[PDB]
């Protein structure tokens, strides 16, 4: 996260860390939506241009963290994966359209003051909060500058941007399954997700029922916090029926 600040303890109890077994490194961020399912970005697991194709056996999920490199004994929980599900139409060949994946944990995790799931938005919440100008929050243990790793989880609140401005900031083809956020060069405020933050949550707090909803997943950007550019996120509501389907077809 670039130009973000340290989070507070228990601020994002749904933040998850995808951790590689060997070498032992942070791979991406992810979020906890139930006691058995984690949501992340599919390019964190599969990206053939760089020969990336992780399997169950290659990852570990760490829940309840704050510090990036420490094993927070008695606070965090480490789980193993049972199955990984990538959207069948995830497009890694062109624009990372439908960049979403679900992971089923080997065993249910127990909630605590540091572990609690986030809500997935329903048509109406999506309709009232995903408006240009409204701010969301992104968290992660990713890089602090384009080219610089934090010791604690970082947070930054960014405004959602109008689709035409999103489209006119890049040469990549934008689809309806994505949205962008960030400040205009003009607004004199900065911030962005960056390498290492991928897979994590973009959330908004409903002013109607006070709950936090995960509206997007950190997907891509061109550099980190460059002026005239924005970060793109998977549109979770637009891919929610897929989510429901694998969950009730394979578990809960």
């Amino acid at each position: 996260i670039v130009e973000g600040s340290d989070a507070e303890i228990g601020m994002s109890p749904w933040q998850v860390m995808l951790f590689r077994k060997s070498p032992q490194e942070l791979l991406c961020g992810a979020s906890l939506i139930s006691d058995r399912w984690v949501l992340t970005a599919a390019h964190c697991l599969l990206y053939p241009p760089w020969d990336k194709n992780f399997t169950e056996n290659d990852l570990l999920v760490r829940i309840g963290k704050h510090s990036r490199t420490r094993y927070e004994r008695n606070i965090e929980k480490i789980s193993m994966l049972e199955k990984i599900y990538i959207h069948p139409r995830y497009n890694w060949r062109e624009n990372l359209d439908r960049d979403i994946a679900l992971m089923k944990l080997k065993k249910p995790v127990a909630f605590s003051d540091y572990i609690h799931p986030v809500c997935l938005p329903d048509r109406e919440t999506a309709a009232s909060l995903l408006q240009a100008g409204y701010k969301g929050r992104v968290t992660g243990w990713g890089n602090l500058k384009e080219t610089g790793q934090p010791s604690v989880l970082q947070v930054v609140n960014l405004p959602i941007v109008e689709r035409p401005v999103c489209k006119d900031s890049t040469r990549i083809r934008i689809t309806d399954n994505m949205f962008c956020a960030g400040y205009k060069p003009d607004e004199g405020k900065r911030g962005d997700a960056c390498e290492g933050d991928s897979g994590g949550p973009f959330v908004m707090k409903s002013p109607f029922n006070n709950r936090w909803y995960q509206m997007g997943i950190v997907s891509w950007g061109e550099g980190c916090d460059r002026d005239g550019k924005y970060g793109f996120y998977t549109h979770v509501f637009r891919l929610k029926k897929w989510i429901q389907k694998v969950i009730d077809q394979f578990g809960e």
């Binding site: 951790f19 570990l60 760490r62 094993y71 480490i78 193993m80 790793q149």
Partner: peptide
């Protein structure tokens, strides 16, 4: 940079 995590999570 990562601290070691307990062996039982690798198996």
């Amino acid at each position: 940079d990562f601290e070691e995590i307990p062996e039982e999570y690798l198996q």
